[PDB]
Each structure stands twice: as C-alpha cells, then as structure tokens.
Ligand binder design. Sequence first.
Ligand code: BS8
Length: 154
Amino acid sequence: ASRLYTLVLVLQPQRVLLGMKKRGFGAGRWNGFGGKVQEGETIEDGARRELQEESGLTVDALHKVGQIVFEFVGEPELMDVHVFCTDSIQGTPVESDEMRPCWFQLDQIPFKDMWPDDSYWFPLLLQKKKFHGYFKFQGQDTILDYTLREVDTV
Ligand SMILES: Nc1nc2nccc(-c3ccncc3F)c2[nH]1
C-alpha cells in the first residue's frame, strides 16, 4: 500500500532552489518541487512535469538521487518519494498562489523551516551521494524511527 511521488531539487554548485508551499499538504515548509505521479506517466516524466507546474522551470535531464518511503502512523498509504536532482534549468522561478521560490546558499539551507527528515538526507544530496530512506512520522513534526542508507543504484 504505497503511492508514488516525485521530488526535484535544482542543485547548483553553490546554491539550491527551494519553494515555500502556501497551502495544502506540507504548507509552510521549504521544499523541492514534486507531487503525485499520474496514470500512464513514467516517474521521471512526472518529476519533470511537477517541476514545471510548481516552479515554472524546464529541466534538461534529471538524475536519480534517492528514494524515501514515508509512513504516517494511522494513515494506510505509504508515500514512496522518488528524489531527483538537476543543475541545468531554463526559465526564471515563478512565484504563484501555490509556491514562493527562493535560492539558498548551501550553508544557509533553512532546515528549521523544512520537514525534519530533510536534515538527515539533504546533506547526502549535497555531497552527491545516493540513498534509500524510510521515515516513520507521528503527525508532521515527530520522527518515531527511521532508516537511511547510501546506495550505488537508486
Ligand atoms: N522534502 C520532504 N520531506 C518530507 N518529509 C515527509 C513528507 C514529505 C512529503 C511532502 C509532500 N508530499 C509528499 C511527501 F511525502 C516530505 N518532503
């Protein structure tokens, strides 16, 4: 019982693009760009589509960097998040009713205003490591337990 999601991080040598979600699930936290994968769509095509819908950017080749499975206690569906990065985009990040984008220097990633698991795996993404993670949450703030391991093949 799992549902597919994508997450794209635009990660350049000295800065990363994040978006502040304004409403809905995850609102109030900085995040990459992503969402649910659609019927008849590959995961990578879904990742590219979500980047455009949410940020206004067009991506040239996505790299698989991780997979994170989220369990929220008391919710039946696990969230199977496929994480991608890119360093080459076209377009200017667009603020909309759903998302406020901002570039961050790597030393200033706003972990206090992100989902708490990001503090664990974002540093691997910054060092160009690939990973498989699992995080069990109670509510949206408490990690009850987790696993996180580096892998050679996502
Ligand atoms: N960067 C990041 N960390 C997260 N932690 C827990 C959940 C989610 C999440 C957000 C939106 N849709 C699905 C999800 F699984 C996270 N996204």
